[PDB]
Amino acid sequence: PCDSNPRGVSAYLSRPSPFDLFIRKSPTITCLVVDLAPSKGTVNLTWSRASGKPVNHSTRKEEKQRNGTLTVTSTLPVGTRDWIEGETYQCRVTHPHLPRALMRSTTKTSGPRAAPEVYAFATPEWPGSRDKRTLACLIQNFMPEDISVQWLHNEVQLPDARHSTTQPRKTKGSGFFVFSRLEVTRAEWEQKDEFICRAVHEAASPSQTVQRAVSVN
């Protein structure tokens, strides 16, 4: 089970995010190879499906890193349908410097699918500042753990770097729970009070989306 790190060279294969999969409706998986050493020839990355059905063209970047190493990333476009229907993709890297080949694969997470429960809140002012108020959004009792949280505001999907979302954690109810925090400015709630904390999960109906409004006062 450890014939997975040829010459020490490790690789990671990321799974499509809920968001990139349901909202954006253009999912893509990424194969990242690390600890490669510079050489005359480049690697020979190769994408393949278990069904045998052909694959779209991929992307590829080779960034010489600061620590003398060399990285290789390759992203691949994936049919939104095929994926949810359990398809399975595999990344196969191969280089002269390498003994055995390196492979990694991934497919839709398994198990029971329980939708998300979301509840949005809002802090009261504090003597420290009278024009800054904090928002929080709790999403629980869901599964799988693959979830994409986000926020809306007057038909504007806020910048990802605006909120802090934690990592899933288990509950005594066989489901997971994640927390989100979005600091806010006075100017914005006077523009409108409706703040939405959406959530994208493989379960939830009917559009695979789930949101709960909020507001101060």
Partner: peptide
């Protein structure tokens, strides 16, 4: 394994071994 030699704070050479 993964020996790297540094020269004046720069990465001179890295090798798997």
């Amino acid at each position: 394994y993964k020996v790297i030699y540094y020269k004046d704070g720069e990465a001179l050479k890295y090798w798997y071994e």
